[PDB]
Design a protein around this ligand. Sequence first.
Ligand SMILES: O=c1[nH]c(=O)n([C@@H]2C[C@H](O)[C@@H](COP(=O)(O)O)O2)cc1F
Ligand SMILES: O=c1[nH]c(=O)n([C@@H]2C[C@H](O)[C@@H](COP(=O)(O)O)O2)cc1F
Lengths: 315, 315
Amino acid sequence: MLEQPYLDLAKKVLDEGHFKPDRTHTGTYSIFGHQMRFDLSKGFPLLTTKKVPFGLIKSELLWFLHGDTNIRFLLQHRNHIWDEWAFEKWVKSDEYHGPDMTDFGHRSQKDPEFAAVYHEEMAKFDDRVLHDDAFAAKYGDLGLVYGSQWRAWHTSKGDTIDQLGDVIEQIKTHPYSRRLIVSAWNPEDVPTMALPPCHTLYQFYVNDGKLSLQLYQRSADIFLGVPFNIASYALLTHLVAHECGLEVGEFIHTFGDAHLYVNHLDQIKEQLSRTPRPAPTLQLNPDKHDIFDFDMKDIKLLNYDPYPAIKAPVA
Amino acid sequence: MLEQPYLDLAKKVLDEGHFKPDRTHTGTYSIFGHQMRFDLSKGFPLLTTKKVPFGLIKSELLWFLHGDTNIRFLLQHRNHIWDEWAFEKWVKSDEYHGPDMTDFGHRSQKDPEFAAVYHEEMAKFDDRVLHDDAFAAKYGDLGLVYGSQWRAWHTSKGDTIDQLGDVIEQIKTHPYSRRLIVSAWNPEDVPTMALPPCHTLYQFYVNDGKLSLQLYQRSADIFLGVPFNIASYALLTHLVAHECGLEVGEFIHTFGDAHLYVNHLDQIKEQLSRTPRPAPTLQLNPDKHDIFDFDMKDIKLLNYDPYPAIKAPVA
Ligand SMILES: O=c1[nH]c(=O)n([C@@H]2C[C@H](O)[C@@H](COP(=O)(O)O)O2)cc1F
Ligand SMILES: O=c1[nH]c(=O)n([C@@H]2C[C@H](O)[C@@H](COP(=O)(O)O)O2)cc1F
């Protein structure tokens, strides 16, 4: 049916699997280069042979059009998609006196109560982020992240240029530019970074009164990740047509390396025996128009009917 | 046969043709998003149902690994691929007294002796570029071009970082990074530019002892252009395996907008009635190893057997 693109690309990775020792080696099957397109006029690509929580996706984009850098705005939206990159600077200097959490992702997975003592200082931290307007300001500004690279390309002669606002005055002044590309890749401070831009850039497009958006994703976690991304940018495509007043068209997801972590192989097999349902229709608050200035109540998903949620070994 | 990817992508543009009034409107058929892959181990992708001059292609890459900005090095290689962007600053201040060449591409095409009076002051200029070591230094440094964005990403705290040298110490220290991406897109001075990066970026890859390279091309001129690009980066892929000491693998060309200028429609039809020949094998000077420090005599193309050269209405 409609989500069929996504679902094929676990088939080819099985049947083309290059087995890479990468990670801490740990195990992966990859491929290199893949495009896979989606008709956004058909229905909205939320995955129906798995249950993908639409809340945490928009809670994260609305982090992104708000130009926002701060763990505090996602937390107070129950969003726990980003914690550990700013809990990486809790295990970092002073105030941090006497738990460890030294490169903790690892020993929590290979834990019993370690994951839990990490789960309790981490929690201490999260609720600081919530309540004191200065510690929060400190550990919480992640600085180079999308909200910033979207809404403030930082220049030499230290200005901030917002790629997103300019490219959509360009879709409003000039429909046909082959130059509506926003790029999250800054080579200067790419090697001073922790996680370089996964979504490297996105080109947009106006064909027949209607708009598309194309994505070069430099690395992708096929199971434990991609279902989410399909929606994050297929919802984006939907909200900037809402500001330019055009129609919706195609989300092209194009890939560089796409892999399937080998710890997950049983689990991707199963939902590939699932049979698709129809896919929901996303509809945005009509009367309001700046996507940049949207809250939560401004996107409702309707008739979404997932299969049960398949559990992580994380990624 | 091998070049068959390229040759299909004029078929789909005919049969999918979105007719865009863009240019000075002038006329185009586009599409939006396209990938098309190439097996570099099969043979080298020089087009055999048209004659594509291999000289001006490598004369231009060797402009590019030399980190070079200067019209003078290409001229003294008979390369006339870049002239008018620096002849755009001949029609610009002083010394320029008394021809016109005001936005001359146009009136030369709609000329008789205009193209020729432009062809004679332009020529005056080209041979200045050749002989006086200061005027040359002036009109000839184009500044933001590949040699510069490849070999000197210019930072805030005004350093120059060479993306190419670092990414190939990364292919030599670390085969499996999903972060070997060089990006020619600088959003700061993209809107202060004349022609923004057409080749936006390229990701590389090491699977099985062997290397691939992927290209996001943001706009492409299907007939009067693309045959050339297929070779420029499929030769690149070949020379950085020569420095990392690996094998050759795949050149993925992926596209954002690909068009076919409508003035050319008769002409693409014809070579689509041509039947492919085999494709040459490119072999590089073995004993020498820095591609950055290659001259001309360091790549020989052998057994290349084109069909005749189809003539331009330019692009
Ligand atoms: O949804 C996600 N998709 C994804 O591709 N990553 C990645 C990909 C890779 O497995 C790792 C980052 O590593 P690298 O940056 O080296 O690709 O996290 C993370 C997510 F949360
Ligand atoms: O080989 C070439 N391929 C190509 O795509 N361009 C382009 C594409 C487009 O037709 C124009 C640049 O316009 P824009 O930058 O708006 O895409 O020149 C130029 C070449 F010489």
